[PDB]
Every structure is written in C-alpha cells, then in structure tokens.
Amino acid sequence: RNCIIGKGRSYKGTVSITKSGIKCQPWSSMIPHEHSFLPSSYRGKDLQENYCRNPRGEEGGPWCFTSNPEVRYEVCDIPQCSEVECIIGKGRSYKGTVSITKSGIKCQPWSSMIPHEHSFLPSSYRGKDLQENYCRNPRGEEGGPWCFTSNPEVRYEVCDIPQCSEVEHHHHHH
C-alpha cells in the first residue's frame, strides 16, 4: 500500500513525487542527477521506475532523486499507515469496535441474553472475538458484521462499516 510502516525500509509502493511536489527522477537515469543507486547493484531494494524508496533504511523515510536540476534529492511525503475502522469483503475478519447497527441501535453484548436470547456465546466461538457488544460476522455470512440489538423489537441487524477499499492507500493504476 501507499503508506509507510516505521521508516519504510521495505516500502514498495508507487508514490513518485517529493514532499515539495517535484516529480522523481527514474533510478535507472543519470539525468539530471548522476548517482550510484544503480538498480542492478541494489536488487532487493526494488529501485523501480521513479518510485520513492528507502534503500538504506534512513530516518527521513522514502526519497528519490528529483527531476529538478536544482534539487538533487528530496524525501517524499508519505503518510504513516494508521488503523481505521473498515471491512474487506464481507468482514469475516473484522475485529474493530463499532457497536451500533445500520439503523443506529446500540448492540446487545454477546455475553447477554437480554433482550434477545441466543447461542452465540463467546466461550463457544473462541477465535471469533465475540467481545463486548462489537459488530462481528462469526460465521462469515454475506451481509457482513452484525449484532443482536438492544431494542426488544429488533432481534438483530447488520452494521454499516465502510469497505477498506474506500479509505486505503491504493497502488496507482500504472
């Protein structure tokens, strides 16, 4: 993805513009800037196209030589990856803390039988993180994470959690 973890020493994404907005120079090119980061000599460091990279693992994060003759190199401005509430596909793996249904009803705790009695006991679904009153999809059903609701007239309802594809840092269409 196009965010970095730590200093991005293994960053392999597609950002190709510096912090000040300068288009990166290709690693294979000596123009404008002549240099020794030859892709054939630095394999495993994935010096591909003109993508920002951190081949030496430095504090600045990924950087590139720049297409501006007056600026030899510059760090890139790549956000640090941060956890956001989202699901992939149907949310079989969702372990977030959303606890309200799509119609805004507070979820009932999984450990509770009130108002709705049920057989989704946390002790019987070890591994599925039936914690507190958090929306979950413990049998990997279509429709996604859901909960029993605190409203006695609504036994259960799906929760509306955004798809991670809406918020993530995508590889560009290159």
Numbering used by the authors: 4 to 177
Sentences from the paper on this structure:
Furthermore, a poly-histidine–tagged variant, designated K1K1H6, was produced to facilitate certain assays and a single kringle 1 domain poly-histidine–tagged variant (K1H6) as a monovalent control. The collected datasets enabled the determination of the molecular structures at 1.8 Å resolution and 1.7 Å for K1K1 and K1K1H6, respectively. Both proteins crystalized in space group P 1 21 1 with K1K1 having two molecules per asymmetric unit and K1K1H6 having one. Structurally, K1K1 and K1K1H6 are nearly identical with a backbone root mean square deviation of 0.8 or 1.8 Å, depending on which of the two molecules in the asymmetric unit of K1K1 is used for alignment with K1K1H6. Both proteins show an elongated “stretched-out” conformation with the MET-binding sites exposed on opposite ends and the N- and C-terminus located at the centre. In K1K1H6, good electron density was also observed for the poly-histidine tag possibly because of stabilising interactions between the histidine residues and residues of the N-terminal kringle domain. The C-terminal poly-histidine tag of K1K1H6 is making contacts with residues in the N-terminal kringle domain. Surprisingly, like the revelation of seeing the first structures of NK1 that presented a likely biologically relevant dimer, both crystal structures show a pseudo C2 symmetry around a central axis and present both receptor-binding sites in nearly identical orientation on either side of the molecule (located around residue Glu37 in the first kringle and residues Glu120 in the second kringle, equivalent to NK1 residue Glu159). For p-Akt, both K1K1H6 and K1K1 show similar phosphorylation in the low nanomolar range with no significant effect caused by the presence or absence of the poly-histidine tag. We next confirmed the direct binding of K1K1H6 to recombinant human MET-Fc chimera, a soluble dimeric protein comprising the whole extracellular part of the MET receptor (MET922 fused to the Fc region of human IgG1) at different concentrations using the AlphaScreen technology.
In this work, we describe the rational design, production, and characterization of K1K1, a novel minimal MET agonist consisting of two copies of the kringle 1 domain of HGF/SF in tandem orientation. On the strength of the structural, biochemical, and mutagenesis data available, we rationalized that a covalent dimer containing a tandem repeat of the K1 domain of HGF/SF could constitute a minimal and stable MET agonist able to diffuse effectively across tissue boundaries owing to the absence of the N-terminal domain of HGF/SF responsible for high-affinity binding to heparan sulphate proteoglycans (HSPG). Therefore, we designed a linker to bridge the distance between the C-terminus of the first K1 domain and the N-terminus of the second one. We chose for that purpose the four–amino acid long linker, SEVE, which is naturally present between kringle 1 and kringle 2 (K2) in HGF/SF.
